[PDB]
Structure formats: C-alpha cells, structure tokens
Amino acid sequence: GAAILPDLGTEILIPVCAVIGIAFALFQWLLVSKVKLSAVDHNVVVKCAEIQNAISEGATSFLFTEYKYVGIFMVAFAILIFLFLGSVEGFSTSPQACSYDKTKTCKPALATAIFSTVSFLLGGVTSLVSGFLGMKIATYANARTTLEARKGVGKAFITAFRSGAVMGFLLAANGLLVLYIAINLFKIYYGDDWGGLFEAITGYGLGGSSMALFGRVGGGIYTKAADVGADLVGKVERNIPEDDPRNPAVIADNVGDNVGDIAGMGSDLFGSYAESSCAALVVASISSFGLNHELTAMLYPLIVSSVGILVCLLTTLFATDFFEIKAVKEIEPALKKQLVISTVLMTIGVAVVSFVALPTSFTIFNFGVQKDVKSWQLFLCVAVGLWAGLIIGFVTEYYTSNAYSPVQDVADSCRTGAATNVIFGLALGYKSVIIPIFAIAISIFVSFTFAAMYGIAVAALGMLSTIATGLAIDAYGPISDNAGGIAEMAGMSHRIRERTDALDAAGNTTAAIGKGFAIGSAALVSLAMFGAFVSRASITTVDVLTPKVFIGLIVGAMLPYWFSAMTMKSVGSAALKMVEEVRRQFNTIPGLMEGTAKPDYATCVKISTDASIKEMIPPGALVMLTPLVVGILFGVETLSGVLAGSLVSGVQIAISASNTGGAWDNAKKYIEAGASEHARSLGPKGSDCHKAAVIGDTIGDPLKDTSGPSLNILIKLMAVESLVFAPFFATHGGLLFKIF
C-alpha cells in the first residue's frame, strides 16, 4: 500500500531540511566572520590578510580558467548526449512502448534525450558550483584559522571545523534541493511515466562526475606540482623551513590546497551523492514504488538524505559548542567522534525514515522480476552501507594516523634512508586494502541479497547519508593546511606553527578517510549502476566465461593503471620543472636566499597552471571516451566486462595509493613534530631521517592527491556514462561484430 508519511509531508520535509541545512551553513559562516582581519600583535594581522589575498586570488584565478575548459567540454558532451540518446528512436516525436512494460505507453525517447541533456547540465553546473563554494569558504577561513591559533589549539580547531561544516552543509543541502527541484520539474512533463522521469534524472549524476573528473585531476596536478617542487628545493636541498616565504613555490602550493583538496574534493563527493541517489531512483522507478506512483517511498533516498542533514547538524554541535580541545592529542579523537556520533544517530534516523516512509511490503525490480522486499530489510541495506563506512574510517585512521604503529614504523624506517621509507609505505598501503574490501564485500552481500540493485544503491546512499559531517571533517584539513602556511609566511612564532601542525596532521588522516568513503560508496553505486545498465541494455546474462565479456573484464581492469600512469607522469614532469624554477631563483636572484629580496611567485603559478590545463585532457578523455568507444565498437557485453574489471581492480590501487601517500605524509609530520622520544630520536628537522621522510612524502603527493582520489571518479563515471547511453549502445553498438 502506502506509508505513514503522506506525499505532501514528503514534499515539505525534503526542502524544509535543505533550507535548514543552508541556514545552518550561513550561521557558521557568520561566526567565522567574527574573527576580523584586513590588509589596509597587530602587524601580523596585515601580513596574514595580504597573504590570504594572494591565495584567494590565485585559487579563483585557476578555477575560472579551469571552468572555461570544463564548461566547454560540458556543452560539447551535452550535445553528444542529445544526439546519441535522441537517435535511438530515429528522433521520432511519437510515444512508444515502455522499456519496462510493453503493455503500457511511454513518453518519446527523444523527450528523454532532451531531459537527460538538461539534468546533465544541471549536474555539471551544480558540480562546478560545489567546488567553487568550498574554495570560497576555505580561502576565507584559512587566515582566520591562523589568527585564532594565537589563542591555543582548541580555538583554531573550532574555526576550521566551523568552516569545514560550511562546505559540508552547503554541498549537502544544495545537492539535495537541486535534485528535488529537477525531479518535480521533470514530473510536470512525465506525468504517470515515472520510469522515464528518473531515467532522465540520471543524467544529473553523469553531469556531476564528469565535471568532478576534471576538477580532481586538474586541481590535483596544479597543487602537487607546486607541493613536490617547494618541498624538495626548500626542505631537502636548501634546509629552509616548509612554507618559507623565500620559496617561490609556496603560493602555488597553498593555492593548490584550495584548488585541489577543497574544490576537486568537493565536486568529487557531490558526484558520489548524486549517482547514489539517482541509482536508487532508477531502480525504484520501475519497482512497486514507481509503478504504483507512491511519491514518499519513491523519494526514500532523498528522505534519508534530508534526515541526514538534521542528524549532522545535531552532531556538529558536539565539536563546535559542547566540547573544547586543550591537548593536541585530543584533535584526532574529536574528529573521529563526529563519525561515531553521526553513525549512531543516523542508525536511529534511518530506522525512523524506514518505519514511516516505506510500506511494510513492496516489490523491487530484479532483472525482469518483481522481488518481494520488507521495509526492515531496506533498513538493513542502508544501514550496512552506513556501518561499512564507519569501519572503513576506523581502518583508515589506523593506517594513516601517527598515533599508531603502522605509520610510526614507517617514520622509523627513515633511520635507514628514503629507500626503506618508500618500501615500508608501499607495503603499508597494499596492506591497508584488506579490511575495506571485506567491509565492501559484506555490504554488497547483505544489500544485494535483500533488494537487488536498489539495495546496493541504497547502501551506497547509506554510506553517504552523513555526507555533511564527512565533508566537514575533510574540508577542515585543507583549511588547517593553509593556516600553517599563512603562519610561516607571516613569520609568526614557533608556537603558532606547532598548533597548526597538530591540526594539519589530523586533517591528513581526515583526508584519507574521505578518500575511503569516496572509494567505498563508489564501489557500491557502480555495482548498482552496472546492474541497472545490464537491464536497460537488455542483456540476459553477464557470463564471465564468454570471449566478449572476458576481454572486456581484463582490459577494463587495466584502465585505472593507464589512468595512473598519465597522472603520475604528469605530476612527475611538472614537479621536475618546478624544482628547476625554485633553484633558478635561489641561485640567480641575489639576496633571495638571504631574505632581503622578493621571489617571483607568478612563475611557479604559471608552471603548475600550464601543466594542469594541458594535461588533465588525456585522462579525462580516457574515462569519457571508454564507455563510448567500447560500447559503440564492441558492444554492451564487452562494456559489461569493462565495468566489472575497472570496479574490482581500480578499487585496490585507489585505496593503496591514498593510504600510502597519507602515511608518508604523517610519518614526515611525526618527525617534524618531535612530540615523543621516538619522534625526537628521528629529528631534528633537517636530519637524514627527516629528509628521507620528505622524499617519501613527495612521492605520496601525486599518489594521494592526483591519481589516487581521482580513481574513484574513473569508476563511478564510466558506470553512469554506460547506464545513460545504454539504449544507444544496445541499438546502434556492437559494430565490429555486426560488420563481420
């Protein structure tokens, strides 16, 4: 039948919560604004703002340049969507048989091509708008976090997390509202044809990850080229401190945090939210929910998202108001509490949403067959994905925090040089993948068993049902990182930079956890999409042991390595040029090393700007062209193979790269902090140990900030892309097999 919550209640609840979310984000922005500063001790406060503006400008300058290219591609690709999807029915204007029920009549395919194009641009534009906001808050709160470190750790933490929360809640509340609006607009046209409505809607997730792919890779290349170049000439060669205003690469470095770690990461996670929702929507759309036009249950994913915002609001209070940090050793435990608190609160929240927004019995589309499903079983589906994420977080903290043996052993290995650091870090990351895969596998079993592709898609949404807290703890990191850079560039005391270093180290672990959630839910949503693709393409069986499927499987598995090779070599070449420029200045600019002369910052921003824009194109092309090339030339069976192989394979290298990189970084931080006998034993800064740690750190740079986190996008992009173009592929694809 129907549920306790009436459709009208759902129609109110969803945007009410979105607006509560947007409201809450503006509140925290206002609080952060209470910290005053301007560029026209008090003398520090002007240097801090003079610096913030250098970064703010540089960040903005890059994103605008990046957006110019990405928006053009967005428009070109939106045309490809219209053409290809429009061509299935010969661009007819008449209705046809429903793909999901020949007895019924649907809206014309050509209408769906148009709405798929529309939802795509919606998603593309919402994606670019996601990273840009996050950059604005990050570049607003960075210097404000510096200044508040003149009052202790706990105060600086607060403004960084408040600001992290601003990014998290704006992104979460705005992605939900745009979807909700899109759905309801689209509905005026589609009427009773919900199947085609949400099939149109799925372009939203395609729009998101498409633009996110270029943000993560483009921003990733900008930031890490500067990162390696600055750190190498500065710390390893000239023995000057990290983030030293003498170093001409420090602006690009700190611009880079916002441009990649914030902007790219923001878009990245939006794509995760959107795909997850869309996936749950397309499967529900042709299940009992959509066939019986029951709006509430249909919009179950958005309802879960809405309560999610509320829960995270309550949670955030525990760190921003209810509690104060006194000891550096409290920072990480504080951040982790957010995960634990919200996971527990949300377990209750989903129980409630399940109990009032679902019928006790319904059906779920199951490869041609309605499957009998109980609401307590959907409860377990979203719950298993929610807990899988907490587990993933806990494991990721274990392998990347310097408060535990794995990372401490790695710092230790510096006693014998960079070579043993690199060897220990590689092995650490390979080691780190075990439990996450297991968490994911359990998630898949539990969710697949209960509710087919819907359960999986809803388990993915489950893992991202706390997306606002997740983003907040993550965005806090690059905000903290920028803060310690403003400290060192304004020549503030040793006491200041020690506090930001404690915050930054926590944000390193935070960033790996985000990377983990991104990878965990990507694996889930991609499987759901893979399944929905197989159905929509009218494949009977994806039989592993057939030539078309296997060559697909083995080639698809090779894809994330190819992508890695591009992006790694990309940073490797750009970083090589950066080293040469920093040297050129330290060697040919008189008085520079002395501290009397000014470094040419712009040259370093130009080097990493030139490299990122030229070199984001091939890996993007690789990921967008593959579904099309394989789908057109080889056919849906093969594209099925490519979808399975790139999922199972790309996940191992994504987890291991991000963790290895995170580890080398925090090992390096450990030595630099000297907060224990062992830590001090490997120092001081400048030591042979410390330098080995820096070598390891800078190899981890592209691994965890360019190639690593982007690999989760490669997977989930190719998956929607395949789902969206499925009708085209099944009709007009397979060419090499037809013409022979």
Residue ranges in contact with K ion by CB under 5 A: 477, 507-508, 511
Q: Please give the residues from 479 up to 498 whose contact with Mg ion meets the rule CB under 5 A.
A: 481
Site string for its own copies, 660-699 (x = CB under 8 A): ----------------------------------xx--xx
Q: Which two tokens stand for residue 48?
A: 């801090």
| Per-residue DSSP letter, 191 | T
Residues of span 498-537 touching Mg ion by CB under 5 A? 508
Beta carbons of 700 and 663 less than 8 angstroms apart: yes
Residue 204, phi then psi, degrees to nearest 5 = -55, -50
Min dist CB 333 to its own copies, Å, is 27
Q: Where are the beta strands (DSSP E) in 382-423?
A: none
Residues 565-594 that bind its own copies (CB under 8 A): 565-566, 568-569, 571-572, 575-576, 579-580
In the list K ion, its own copies, Mg ion, none, the entry touching 477 (Cβ below 5 to 8 angstroms by class) is: K ion
From residue 693 to residue 732, what is the string marking binding to its own copies with x (rule CB under 8 A)? Answer: -xx--xx--xx-----------------------------
Tell me which DSSP letter residue 415 carries: G
CB of 559 to its own copies, least distance (A): 10
* Nearest distance from C-beta of residue 224 to Mg ion, angstroms: 7
| Distance in angstroms (rounded) separating the CA atoms of residues 560 and 127 | 23
Question: 431, 584, 685, 732: which one contacts its own copies (CB under 8 A)?
Answer: 431
- Binding residue for its own copies (CB under 8 A) from 4, 16, 97, 434? 434
Minimum CB–partner distance for residue 284 and its own copies (Å): 18
Contact 144, 32 (CB under 8 A): yes
Contact pattern from residue 651 through residue 680 relative to Mg ion, giving x for each residue in contact according to CB under 5 A and a dash for the rest: --------------x---------------
135 contact, one of its own copies, Mg ion, K ion, none, CB 5-8 Å limit per kind = none
* Positions 217 through 256 that interact with Mg ion (CB under 5 A): 227, 231
Residue 731 CB burial class (10 angstroms; 0-12, 13-18, ≥19): middle
Residue 372 is labelled as binding a ligand: no
Select 110 or 692, whichever has its Cβ closest to Mg ion.
Answer: 692
Unique residue bearing structure tokens 């990461």? 265
The full DSSP string for 616-681 is SHHHHHHHHHHHHHHHHHT-HHHHHHHHHHHHHHHHHHHHHHHHHHHHHHHHHHHHHH--SHHHHH
508 is in an annotated binding site: yes
Question: Position 505: which residue type?
Answer: A
Q: What are phi and psi of 104, to 5 degrees?
A: -105, 160
The answer to whether 41 is a known ligand-binding residue is no
Question: How many chain residues interact with Mg ion (CB under 5 A)?
Answer: 7
CA atoms within 13 A on the CB side of 132: 16
Q: Which does 285 bind (CB under 5 to 8 A by kind): its own copies, Mg ion, K ion, none?
A: none
Report CA dihedral (517, 184, 208, 72) to the nearest 10 degrees. -170
The token pair at 291 is 């066939």
Residue 665's binding partner among K ion, its own copies, Mg ion, none (Cβ under 5 to 8 angstroms by kind) is: Mg ion
Among 461, 486, 542, 632, binds its own copies (CB under 8 A): 542
**Residue in 427, 617, 633, 679 binding its own copies, rule: CB under 8 A:** 427
Q: Measure the N-to-C terminal CA separation of the chain; round to a whole number of Å.
A: 52
Q: Is 243 annotated for ligand binding? A: no
Q: Is 412 annotated as a binding residue?
A: no
Q: Whose structure tokens read 């046809």?
A: 96
Among 89, 148, 193, 257, binds Mg ion (CB under 5 A): 257
* d(C-alpha 422, C-alpha 543), whole Å: 40
Contact status: 369 vs its own copies (CB under 8 A): no
Does residue 499 contact residue 149 with C-beta atoms inside 8 Å? Answer: yes
Dihedrals phi, psi of 96, to nearest 5 degrees: -150, 180
597 is an interface residue for its own copies by CB under 8 A: no
Choice between 129 and 647, CB closer to its own copies: 647
Instruction: Estimate to the nearest angstrom the gap between the alpha carbon of 187 and the chain centroid.
Output: 30
- For 90, phi and psi rounded to 5 degrees? 70, 20
- Is 651 one of the binding residues for its own copies (CB under 8 A)? yes
Annotated binding site for Mg(2+): 227, 231, 257, 481, 508, 665, 701
Annotated binding site: 224, 227, 231, 257, 481, 508, 665, 701, 704
Q: Using CB under 5 A as the criterion, which residues of the chain lie in contact with Mg ion when the complex forms?
A: 227, 231, 257, 481, 508, 665, 701
